[PDB]
Design a binder for this molecule. Sequence first.
Ligand SMILES: OC[C@H]1O[C@H](O[C@H]2[C@H](O)[C@@H](O)[C@@H](O[C@H]3[C@H](O)[C@@H](O)[C@@H](O[C@H]4[C@H](O)[C@@H](O)[C@@H](O[C@H]5[C@H](O)[C@@H](O)[C@@H](O[C@H]6[C@H](O)[C@@H](O)[C@@H](O[C@H]7[C@H](O)[C@@H](O)[C@@H](O)O[C@@H]7CO)O[C@@H]6CO)O[C@@H]5CO)O[C@@H]4CO)O[C@@H]3CO)O[C@@H]2CO)[C@H](O)[C@@H](O)[C@@H]1O
Ligand SMILES: OC[C@H]1O[C@H](O[C@H]2[C@H](O)[C@@H](O)[C@@H](O[C@H]3[C@H](O)[C@@H](O)[C@@H](O[C@H]4[C@H](O)[C@@H](O)[C@@H](O[C@H]5[C@H](O)[C@@H](O)[C@@H](O[C@H]6[C@H](O)[C@@H](O)[C@@H](O[C@H]7[C@H](O)[C@@H](O)[C@@H](O)O[C@@H]7CO)O[C@@H]6CO)O[C@@H]5CO)O[C@@H]4CO)O[C@@H]3CO)O[C@@H]2CO)[C@H](O)[C@@H](O)[C@@H]1O
Ligand SMILES: OC[C@H]1O[C@@H](O[C@H]2[C@H](O)[C@@H](O)[C@@H](O[C@H]3[C@H](O)[C@@H](O)[C@@H](O[C@H]4[C@H](O)[C@@H](O)[C@@H](O)O[C@@H]4CO)O[C@@H]3CO)O[C@@H]2CO)[C@H](O)[C@@H](O)[C@@H]1O
Length: 628
Amino acid sequence: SPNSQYLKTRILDIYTPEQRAGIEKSEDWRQFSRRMDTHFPKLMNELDSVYGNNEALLPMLEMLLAQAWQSYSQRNSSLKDIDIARENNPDWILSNKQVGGVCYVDLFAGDLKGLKDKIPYFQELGLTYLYLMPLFKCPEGKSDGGYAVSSYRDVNPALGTIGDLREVIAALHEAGISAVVDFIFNHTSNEHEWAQRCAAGDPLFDNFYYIFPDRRMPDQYDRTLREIFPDQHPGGFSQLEDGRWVWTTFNSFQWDLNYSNPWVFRAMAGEMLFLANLGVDILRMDAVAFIWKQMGTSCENLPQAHALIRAFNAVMRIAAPAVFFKSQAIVHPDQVVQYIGQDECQIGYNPLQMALLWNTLATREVNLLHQALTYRHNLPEHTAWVNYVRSHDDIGWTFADEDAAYLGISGYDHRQFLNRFFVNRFDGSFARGVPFQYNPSTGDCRVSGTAAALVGLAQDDPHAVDRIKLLYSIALSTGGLPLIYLGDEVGTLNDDDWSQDSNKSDDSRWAHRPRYNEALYAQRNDPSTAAGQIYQGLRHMIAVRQSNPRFDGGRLVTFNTNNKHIIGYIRNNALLAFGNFSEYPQTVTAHTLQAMPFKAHDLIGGKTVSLNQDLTLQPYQVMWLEIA
Ligand SMILES: OC[C@H]1O[C@H](O[C@H]2[C@H](O)[C@@H](O)[C@@H](O[C@H]3[C@H](O)[C@@H](O)[C@@H](O[C@H]4[C@H](O)[C@@H](O)[C@@H](O[C@H]5[C@H](O)[C@@H](O)[C@@H](O[C@H]6[C@H](O)[C@@H](O)[C@@H](O[C@H]7[C@H](O)[C@@H](O)[C@@H](O)O[C@@H]7CO)O[C@@H]6CO)O[C@@H]5CO)O[C@@H]4CO)O[C@@H]3CO)O[C@@H]2CO)[C@H](O)[C@@H](O)[C@@H]1O
Ligand SMILES: OC[C@H]1O[C@H](O[C@H]2[C@H](O)[C@@H](O)[C@@H](O[C@H]3[C@H](O)[C@@H](O)[C@@H](O[C@H]4[C@H](O)[C@@H](O)[C@@H](O[C@H]5[C@H](O)[C@@H](O)[C@@H](O[C@H]6[C@H](O)[C@@H](O)[C@@H](O[C@H]7[C@H](O)[C@@H](O)[C@@H](O)O[C@@H]7CO)O[C@@H]6CO)O[C@@H]5CO)O[C@@H]4CO)O[C@@H]3CO)O[C@@H]2CO)[C@H](O)[C@@H](O)[C@@H]1O
Ligand SMILES: OC[C@H]1O[C@@H](O[C@H]2[C@H](O)[C@@H](O)[C@@H](O[C@H]3[C@H](O)[C@@H](O)[C@@H](O[C@H]4[C@H](O)[C@@H](O)[C@@H](O)O[C@@H]4CO)O[C@@H]3CO)O[C@@H]2CO)[C@H](O)[C@@H](O)[C@@H]1O
């Protein structure tokens, strides 16, 4: 394997003797050269673990590094300042000051120019992190809501131009808000240039995807593949008009990229640098678990998948240090945490906490949630969870069956209940969600619906508002970067028209992807409305979180409340949080509270609470007690 010094001299060979002398003395080269020495070793090691002695590795690597240099040379000075700042502030992601929001540009504000005008509201809410859903070109009609990318560089004409996007990002930065977008690196649309040329037999794009002559290998692979989008096709392959078969984990128009081909990595690393230089702060690594395939396995979470992501990480450490990764690994808890690391994905979605929040509302029992917060919350230094209540996606019931079995709970049976309860097929349920990808062959099913619809706000359940505040309170205070699904802060309901829409009827997730509700937003400052009660309740928690250092960091220690309906945890040994998941008053006994201070101030209600006597929490009440 070549070393950093050797490779750097060859990067400079593009310049004439005279030009070269100027580059070697430039500040940009000084930074790049230093970062190469520090991080290239990791990059080389990761790529070697995946490609081994592949003859194309070295040639690909030199091409990639040459690109990295040019990319960094062109990188705007302001971004380079952010580069140095985060290089010396790895834990910026762990600060209690951070609060994020996510939205679709078209649904929430029409287009990019309209989005820029919403910035004042984002500052009003207190956001310091804004994630925008897929905004680049995609097939007309069905494109999986933008996740079937036809181009990683050309903005969806309906949203605006690449110029509008660069203006939006600069505007977000001026407002003190970080920009976050998707890095849909596991697959492209079948209309993407690479896909077309690969299928047409263009040698330049040979092996850019996984295409087979017949069903021989696809059948073999399907023996162990899990069906992700069973409604669209069985197994993981789709057939082309010419009879051949292509690997398609998701929709048939989404073709899985072939990372076993080093040139595919190079290509995607090139797109990553492009996004980096737009000023993007964080890239959401979409469907990270599927980037490597191997016959006989589920082709999810394989070792090479982690190595590839760590390789991508090194490229940013070298040519755009400011860019961090947000892992979107919706898999078994043991696998989720493996993508999170300073050298892999600095932050990652916390599907376990999310799924268990909803689980707890349904069962009224915190057993599973307590278990998760106790044994699966703390993360390695310089990393953090992205805690959420809802997203643009369906809700998958993430949790370890082995953990549940320890609590006397059967995973399969329990999920049957959870799905029934949340799609309102269980007597007494307050939830009004809808099924997503029900698989009759496995009994598996996921749930669609907005947060408000799942807590019963659609039928005006008197507990709806408090349930919303309870769930978000946990994502906002457990430790990690909280991500609010914009629209939730005013109780936005499902869009019931989706099922009638020809391009959406086959995907129930559109039920929870409603447009900006002007009526609800106009009520956000009215305490007599659900929208105002929700907004002010959440805004208050956001205010407290960002100003009170007791919430800083991502570590917590659970507190045994001795009441199966109340969750409890402590932040920095100074903030004791209690959350009642019962629709009835629940008590934490004075006996249980003996080690706590005589009295403590509750940041939610603002009153002084006595902990030397039984503490009774009203239905769904949340308390944030300052015990130090
Ligand atoms: O651009 C496309 C798309 O991308 C984004 O969103 C994507 C995600 O990126 C992608 O990951 C995916 O997430 C899906 C997921 O793939 C689905 O499978 C599902 O996952 C849920 C599931 O519905 C729940 O049931 C629950 O799974 C449990 C499971 O119930 C439980 O039993 C256990 O299962 C493990 C089992 O215990 C093990 O023994 C073993 O099982 C083996 C056997 O051992 C073996 O003998 C044989 O039988 O095979 C078995 C299976 O291999 O492994 C089992 C698997 O771990 O544990 C699991 C996990 O706790 O929870 C999971 C969630 O983790 O739904 C999610 C989505 O909710 O798809 C999304 C899109 O939906 C992008 O955001 C999106 O917009 C784009 O469209
Ligand atoms: O207002 C409009 C509204 O009208 C309708 O709703 C009505 C109902 O029709 C009416 O009956 C009533 O419902 C009340 C009820 O009267 C109250 O008592 C209360 O219900 C309690 C319930 O009595 C308690 O037992 C408790 O149940 C929990 C349970 O404690 C918890 O463990 C869990 O249980 C599930 C378990 O977690 C799952 O694993 C599974 O268990 C499986 C195993 O997995 C399997 O291995 C094997 O063992 O089989 C097991 C089967 O038992 O399933 C378990 C559930 O069966 O969850 C349950 C349910 O939460 O707590 C509840 C709640 O405190 O509240 C209800 C609701 O208020 O009044 C309402 C309202 O007027 C209409 O139906 C509704 O849609 C409309 O919105
Ligand atoms: O290495 C960590 C360190 O933690 C020490 O204590 C922490 C403990 O692990 C954690 O559970 C919690 O402790 C509180 C209990 O959860 C809570 O129930 C309550 O305990 C009462 C019992 O429930 C009653 O049965 C009776 O015993 O009275 C108890 C009150 O004295 O309060 C506990 C104190 O907050 O937090 C602790 C620190 O935040 C371990 O003790 C130590 O061995 C570990 O090394």
